[PDB]
Amino acid sequence: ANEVIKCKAAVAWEAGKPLSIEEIEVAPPKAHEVRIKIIATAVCHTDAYTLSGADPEGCFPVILGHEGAGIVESVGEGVTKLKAGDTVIPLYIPQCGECKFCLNPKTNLCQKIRVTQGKGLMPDGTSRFTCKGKTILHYMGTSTFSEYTVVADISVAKIDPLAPLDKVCLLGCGISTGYGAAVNTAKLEPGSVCAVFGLGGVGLAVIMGCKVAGASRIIGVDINKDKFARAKEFGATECINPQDFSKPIQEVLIEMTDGGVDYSFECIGNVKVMRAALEACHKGWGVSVVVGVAASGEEIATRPFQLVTGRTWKGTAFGGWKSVESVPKLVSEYMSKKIKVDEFVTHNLSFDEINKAFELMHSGKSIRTVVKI
Amino acid sequence: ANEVIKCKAAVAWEAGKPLSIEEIEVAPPKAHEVRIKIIATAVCHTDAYTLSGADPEGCFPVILGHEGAGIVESVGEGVTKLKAGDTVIPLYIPQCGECKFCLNPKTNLCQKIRVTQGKGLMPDGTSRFTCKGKTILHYMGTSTFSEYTVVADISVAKIDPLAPLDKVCLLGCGISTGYGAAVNTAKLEPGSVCAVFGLGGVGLAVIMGCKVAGASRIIGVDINKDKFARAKEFGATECINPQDFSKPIQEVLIEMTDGGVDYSFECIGNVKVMRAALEACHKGWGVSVVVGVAASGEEIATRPFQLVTGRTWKGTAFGGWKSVESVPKLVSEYMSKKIKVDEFVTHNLSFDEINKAFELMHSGKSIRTVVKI
């Protein structure tokens, strides 16, 4: 039978402190739950933002991490589509396939377990993690910063058994989000002129998507010129630094493109840049997609004239991919060389030095750091 | 040859004052211009906005009016598609069919004569109107508040010769804008759940379009309950007054539709209602279209979370209709009973009583007042 597992995990006891490598207990999977052995995980801005304690609904203690890949260790009662040994990727955006959202082709925002997940609990209202006599909360329904995690059975994508887990764990968030922003949300046409604000993993993934879509011109924008080289390798036709111009960035872009871009993507989470991205779009048909997540309370603004004269403001979550059915296909596209994943890995670390992954992010010297469990 | 015409026109000598019926002179049409005998014209909120003096672009003296219908009196050199006697509708949104906007299927914002039109001048940089020795400016390239006006040849739609001009003049702006917002900008699908903010002529046209598109639910919203009766006649399934609730209107709509509407349309020009219209949209796939024109300087705002979680913000100008080719089609749809026009006329006045149309508009007692020249 499925026994409690004693393993290692990176616990965040409180905000503003480095993660603590602890020995924890992981309970067996209950009905419709899946226990996964995490093989590799990466760190994302979102993990750091929750860890900083600036996130309103961020609670502690908690096991963070939402970019991972592993193998099913055991399944709970009623689970038949998955079994021990299956190669998988945990999903923070699930796909029950039955709610009004899953049934609507225009969205991927399954709401089946959103409430419990937001509270760091499994669908039944409890947590499977414990450490030193204390209950530890789940995070984004994945909690990949542990040798073993338990997730709702609708939060699992079964992928190619041959996929390199130390690479595809990145499809758990960043790459998929940016790529999907281009092909699912924007659905840009061949020849499109694009502008991408923010050249981190998300922005690079957007560029990658724009290239797959056949974009003619792809202008990368970042205040950190060190990000330009890789952006060009991904397909950016040119890059510009807002700091190099006295005029607002939207004015610069409008001048460069004789009117503005056909599509702009904000991959930073800065409301001021979001406005610039919208205003940088061409009159009549320009479309701007918000991909970055802004701090709570902050709002975007512009003059309605911008919309009346043809521009559209959109946003995306996990690139609009219906998770369970898309992630496996994304893995296959990587396996077949249609999209890149390896090029996103700039650093590799062992589980014990996971905190170094956070240092690297604050330093601005990394795209994605893969942590080997 | 074509001589100078001495006729009457409603001149706006200065901001904040009523219009004055004056004896003016209308010069003959120059190359690529068309002189039109106006038979009927209506008054629109935009005309009042400019007359008030609040319009940063408003210049005086000027002959306002952009909702009209008439007969071609004469044409200038180089004009062959039009001739004396043709039944027409002046267009504030022209269609040269050659600029980058006209060539793009995604917009109707022809820019060929925008500069001169914004200055109240014909394409050659001069005005065809004079009164008591003074130059009188054109307005929105149409100046329909005159027995005779001169417009650019690309600002003319030739229509069905049997069309009643005292009715189709309304297709010059209001009806076309609202109808188009639904079928062109929103492109709502059959069964869609919609909300229309503002039940004036524009909102009624939106409702009309939603019904043609096969919406399952059309919720009209207006603080003036006297507008509900006609809204229901146009197809509204129910009407609500924001004043009858203590919660923000978006919360009311969300609760009424189990999540929000599929499509919302703001037909008021109120930035606060614009935000509410967006937020009243369903998570994941809701789309809000701004149709009303907000006062200069004001801006719309919301939390980017609204977009990231699936909502889309759009806007429209003259319903997205490429003017020259669309208006004749709209007249034909009216003649065949596909769309309504007569139902928008609530009042009729003589030219000398034109100022009463403005009074009726501000009193909130009318939808559209048709002025017989």
Ligand SMILES: Nc1ncnc2c1ncn2[C@@H]1O[C@H](COP(=O)(O)OP(=O)(O)OC[C@H]2O[C@@H](O)[C@H](O)[C@@H]2O)[C@@H](O)[C@H]1O
């Ligand atoms: N004002 C700015 N203008 C242009 N670029 C900027 C600006 N401010 C920051 N940037 C650049 O934005 C980039 C952000 O990339 P990352 O921090 O590495 O984050 P990433 O993983 O790519 O995701 C970014 C955003 O998208 C969301 O999906 C994610 O949660 C975060 O909100 C960095 O290169 C940063 O220099």
Ligand SMILES: Nc1ncnc2c1ncn2[C@@H]1O[C@H](COP(=O)(O)OP(=O)(O)OC[C@H]2O[C@@H](O)[C@H](O)[C@@H]2O)[C@@H](O)[C@H]1O
């Ligand atoms: N806060 C509000 N909430 C709901 N309805 C409102 C509100 N404020 C005003 N209204 C209603 O909005 C309606 C506006 O209709 P009209 O004044 O008759 O204007 P209309 O011709 O329909 O055009 C409206 C708008 O569209 C624009 O493009 C046009 O220039 C104007 O900005 C009126 O019925 C008014 O009662």
Ligand SMILES: [K+]
């Ligand atoms: K598109």
Ligand SMILES: [K+]
């Ligand atoms: K649509």
Ligand SMILES: [Zn+2]
């Ligand atoms: Zn679902």
Ligand SMILES: [Zn+2]
């Ligand atoms: Zn993430």
Ligand SMILES: [Zn+2]
């Ligand atoms: Zn044109």
Ligand SMILES: [Zn+2]
């Ligand atoms: Zn108008």
